[PDB]
Amino acid sequence: GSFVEMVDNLRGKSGQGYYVEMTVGSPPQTLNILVDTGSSNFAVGAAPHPFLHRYYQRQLSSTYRDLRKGVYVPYTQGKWEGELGTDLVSIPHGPNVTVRANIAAITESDKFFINGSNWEGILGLAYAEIARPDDSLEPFFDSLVKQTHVPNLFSLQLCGAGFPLNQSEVLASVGGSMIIGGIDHSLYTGSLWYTPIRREWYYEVIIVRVEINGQDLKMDCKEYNYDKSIVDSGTTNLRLPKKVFEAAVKSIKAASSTEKFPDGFWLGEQLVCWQAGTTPWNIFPVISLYLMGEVTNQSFRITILPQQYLRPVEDVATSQDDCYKFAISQSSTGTVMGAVIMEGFYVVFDRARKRIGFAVSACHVHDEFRTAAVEGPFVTLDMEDCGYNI
Numbered sequence: 398g399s400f401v402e403m404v405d406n407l408r409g410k411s412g413q414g415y416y417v418e419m420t421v422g423s424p425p426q427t428l429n430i431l432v433d434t435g436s437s438n439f440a441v442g443a444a445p446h447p448f449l450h451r452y453y454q455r456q457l458s459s460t461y462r463d464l465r466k467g468v469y470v471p472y473t474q475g476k477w478e479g480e481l482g483t484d485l486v487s488i489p490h491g492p493n494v495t496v497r498a499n500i501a502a503i504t505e506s507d508k509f510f511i512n513g514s515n516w517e518g519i520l521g522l523a524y525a526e527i528a529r530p531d532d533s534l535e536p537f538f539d540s541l542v543k544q545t546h547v548p549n550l551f552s553l554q555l556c557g558a559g560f561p562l563n564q565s566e567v568l569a570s571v572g573g574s575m576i577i578g579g580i581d582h583s584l585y586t587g588s589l590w591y592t593p594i595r596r597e598w599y600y601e602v603i604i605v606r607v608e609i610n611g612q613d614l615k616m617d618c619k620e621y622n623y624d625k626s627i628v629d630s631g632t633t634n635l636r637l638p639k640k641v642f643e644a645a646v647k648s649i650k651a652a653s654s655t656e657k658f659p660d661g662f663w664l665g666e667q668l669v670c671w672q673a674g675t676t677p678w679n680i681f682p683v684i685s686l687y688l689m690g691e692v693t694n695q696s697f698r699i700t701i702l703p704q705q706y707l708r709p710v711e712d713v714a715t716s717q718d719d720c721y722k723f724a725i726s727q728s729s730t731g732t733v734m735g736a737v738i739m740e741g742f743y744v745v746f747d748r749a750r751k752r753i754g755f756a757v758s759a760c761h762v763h764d765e766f767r768t769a770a771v772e773g774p775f776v777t778l779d780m781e782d783c784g785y786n787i
């Protein structure tokens with residue numbers, strides 16, 4: 398591991414997000430910031446909110462610069478609005494550099510901040526094309542790379558605990574690593590396999606085959622990427638296009654048929670519980686997503702376990718049972734490889750070479766019989782046809 402200063406710099410969990418400490422302004426104001434590979438704005442709470450115990454105070458920063466422009470960002474289940482400006486930004490457990498970056502000072506929001514998440518802002522790590530108000534507002538990572546010698550690449554190791562963490566525990570536990578400018582070899586086992594970034598807006602990739610316990614879902618592969626497939630640390634679940642979700646759930650139900658679960662469990666709404674230590678991992682199937690490789694007609698696969706797609710949650714009765722929610726859900730906006738999938742792997746966002754790498758994570762949860770995997774190569778033809786075009 399050559400990046401010790403950045404190893405173990407994340408905290409959090411899949412359901413509320415993983416965050417990194419950052420500082421903004423002069424003198425530095427410390428804030429915890431959500432790592433979000435699914436957006437491209439650096440936006441921080443800048444006014445009192447019931448769920449924030451701190452926020453960015455522009456009037457206290459000598460280096461604050463007002464851009465005299467507002468920004469409104471509505472999204473699926475909420476929105477955030479703010480005032481744009483720039484200031485000096487640093488990451489204490491990151492590269493030892495300070496850069497001048499755009500900051501959206503959030504003045505109003507709806508269903509954005511999460512009670513008990515411990516973060517006060519978000520770091521959009523995707524490309525300018527999806528930055529708001531438009532692509533002229535340079536994203537943080539672009540600024541970092543342009544102003545310093547930091548390589549144009551970052552990598553993420555999100556570590557799920559495999560069991561519920563109470564408030565004190567989640568504040569004291571290490572949730573993973575965000576390595577800025579490099580790859581730390583202590584964070585993964587086996588080899589790294591790369592898939593091309595299809596287009597630079599979201600971190601878009603192409604899935605070419607899907608298996609449930611080795612059985613091919615056998616759908617037209619364009620269905621797997623309708624209308625896109627992205628890697629998003631800001632989403633909790635593995636989200637799949639409606640038809641793919643329906644096919645996958647049918648296959649997962651068939652594989653786990655020795656136990657019957659209520660419809661609410663499969664809808665990802667209700668938890669299922671087992672007596673302490675008796676979770677029947679073995680009856681649930683592994684899921685393999687084959688991704689386009691860097692070589693023509695070549696693919697590789699990433700395989701996750703139920704220890705990744707069953708999200709630990711505390712029982713309504715705080716009992717001693719081990720409980721979980723099904724963390725695979727349907728989408729009308731494409732496939733989303735959320736945090737529960739990322740928890741199985743060390744993911745390298747190699748912006749410089751327009752590719753995303755995957756390797757088995759040194760902190761993935763598993764049992765004595767099965768482990769997550771990243772394997773290849775496999776001969777796969779006409780993979781370009783798996784991409785969807787409007």
Ligand SMILES: CCC[C@H]1CN(Cc2ccc(CN3C(=N)N[C@](CCC4CCCCC4)(CC4CCCCC4)C3=O)cc2)C(=O)N1
Nearest residue numbers: 412413414433435436470472473509527629631632633634
């Ligand atoms: C952290 C875990 C939270 C829960 C909520 N939750 C549902 C959910 C639904 C959609 C998205 C996609 N997504 C995203 N990655 N960032 C934003 C802006 C996208 C951006 C794209 C370009 C155009 C402008 C908006 C803001 C979010 C970021 C997370 C905090 C809330 C606001 C967004 O909507 C993520 C999560 C989930 O699963 N776990």
